[PDB]
Amino acid sequence: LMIELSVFLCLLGCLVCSWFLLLLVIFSGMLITHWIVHVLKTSVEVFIWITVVLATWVMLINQPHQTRKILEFVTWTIVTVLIGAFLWLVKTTLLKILASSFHLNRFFDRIQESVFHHSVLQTLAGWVVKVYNDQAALKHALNDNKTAVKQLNKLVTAILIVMMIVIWLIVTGIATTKLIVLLSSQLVVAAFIFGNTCKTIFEAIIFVFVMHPFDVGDRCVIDGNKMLVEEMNILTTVFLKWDKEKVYYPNSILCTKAIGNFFRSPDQGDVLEFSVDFTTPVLKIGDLKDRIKMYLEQNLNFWHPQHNMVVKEIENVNKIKMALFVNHTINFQDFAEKNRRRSELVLELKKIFEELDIKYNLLPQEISIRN
Ligand SMILES: CCCCCCCCCCCCCCCC(=O)O
């Protein structure tokens, strides 16, 4: 309740009106004055507030063996807190920077449409539901590629808190040296035993944030398996297979694989292999090449004009193996579209063989009947 905060402010004012105790009350009150001064923001406000409190306390302030020591305790506790706030602020800034690397521009058009719609809803308002439902869909689409960062933040924070506890224990002088030595000794033993798990976690972090072979929604190829990335985390990546089975891969194994990424690929190519009889006249082979050229040229929304036909080999004297190399106008992120276009090309090849009378026969077999 703002009223309670205001009451506390009033109480502090009363303490001053009725001076170190009042100054202390002003700090104890956790006054919103810093927020007003500030009207990353809240990490900055805390940092400033702590800094002011420390400076005030030191300026505000016989029994060196008995009570003076409490002043040392307080001095250093406040300092530890300020160190903590500082590191906290640094952490936040760096993680925000990291997160920006996960912004995807694939949503640029959706973002611009949403900005326009929300701008007009501020003045022409009095369709609207679609705008808000699309806004929600976009916010989730963008937040889905930042889940690894949120996880890293939790991990880093836990480490940071522990580091600050240790700093407090040391800087205030509360810890003694025999316990510090036993503490460090046990930590080394723990590292010895569980260090290998930490190595794995760290390597997974490098894979996800530095190597970064894929993002969410990309269609990737791993060990010949074409899979869509559903989500990314620090320890695991979740993929959908072509039949939509959900598959969980340890990042520790993906870190050692060659990963294809269709989303990021340039227009991809393809191959149609076939065979014809050895006796097919070279003239029909020439006609086949011309017919194919015309087909591809009549369908430039699907095919680039560059293609090659390669004659590979003569098997016995019966078969000629050939292959047609073509180039699609798309990459293979939309796999179904790729197959539909290829399917039409295969049927065109069928048609050409029929029209040009291209066949394949089996070698003849000689029979001798004994009776
Ligand atoms: C804080 C240390 C925990 C030990 C595991 C190291 C990774 C930090 C925890 C982040 C979650 C990793 C991904 C698991 C899947 C999920 O979160 O749903």
358 to 8, 208, 276, 311, 362: CA distances (angstroms): 95, 53, 7, 15, 14
Pick from 149, 150, 151, 152 the residue to mutate for probing ligand 1's pocket: most ligand atoms within 8 Å of its CB: 151
- Measured in Å, residue 221 CA sits from the centre of ligand 1 at 25
Place of tokens 């009947």: 369
Do 158 and 250 lie in one domain? The reply is: no
- Six-digit token pair at 289? 């090449």
User: What value, to the nearest 5°, has the Cα angle with vertex 28 and ends 26 and 33?
Assistant: 50
Handedness of CA 251, 257, 260, 264 (dihedral sign): positive
Sheet containing 225-232: which strands, arranged edge to edge?
Answer: 246-250, 236-240, 225-232, 219-222, 259-261
Radius of gyration of the chain (CA): 36
Q: Identify the experimental approach.
A: cryo-EM
Is there a contact between 231 and 216 (Cβ–Cβ < 8 Å)? yes
Do 48 and 108 lie in one domain? The reply is: yes
Contacts of 160 (CB under 8 A, 6+ apart): 84, 87, 88, 91
The number of the ligand 1 atom at minimal distance from the alpha carbon of 233 is 13
Do 255 and 338 lie in one domain? The reply is: no
- Measured in Å, residue 149 CA sits from the centre of ligand 1 at 11
Do 181 and 244 lie in one domain? The reply is: no
Do 253 and 275 lie in one domain? The reply is: no
Place of tokens 């993680």: 95
300 within ligand 1 shell (Cβ under 6 A): no
Q: What torsion, rounded to 10 degrees, do the Cα atoms 149, 150, 155, 161 define?
A: 120
Measured CA to CA, the distance from residue 287 to residue 294 in angstroms comes to 11
- Six-digit token pair at 316? 């016995």
- Measured in Å, residue 212 CA sits from the centre of ligand 1 at 18
Instruction: Give the bridge partners for 275, in sequence order.
Output: 321
Which among 159, 184, 180 has a CA at the least distance from the CA of 170? Answer: 180
Measured CA to CA, the distance from residue 58 to residue 75 in angstroms comes to 7
Do 252 and 187 lie in one domain? The reply is: no
Do 197 and 90 lie in one domain? The reply is: yes
Is there a contact between 174 and 73 (Cβ–Cβ < 8 Å)? yes
Instruction: Give the bridge partners for 308, in sequence order.
Output: 325
Helix ranges, 126-234 (H)? 128-143, 147-171, 177-206
Q: What are phi and psi of 225, to 5 degrees?
A: -95, 120
Handedness of CA 328, 331, 334, 335 (dihedral sign): positive
Q: What are phi and psi of 156, to 5 degrees?
A: -65, -40
Asked if the structure places residue 179 within a domain, the reply is yes
Q: Which domain holds residue 11?
A: 2-117+127-203
Which among 323, 320, 312 has a CA at the least distance from the CA of 360? Answer: 320
Measured CA to CA, the distance from residue 162 to residue 176 in angstroms comes to 18
Which among 276, 213, 281, 277 has a CA at the least distance from the CA of 249? Answer: 213
235 within ligand 1 shell (Cβ under 6 A): yes
Pick from 95, 152, 155 the residue to mutate for probing ligand 1's pocket: most ligand atoms within 8 Å of its CB: 155
Number of other CB atoms surrounding residue 283 within 10 Å: 9
Residue 244's CATH number: 2.30.30
Measured CA to CA, the distance from residue 307 to residue 325 in angstroms comes to 5
- For 328, which DSSP code? B
234 within ligand 1 shell (Cβ under 6 A): yes
State the number of CA atoms in the 13 A half-sphere of 323 facing the CB: 8
- Measured in Å, residue 87 CA sits from the centre of ligand 1 at 22
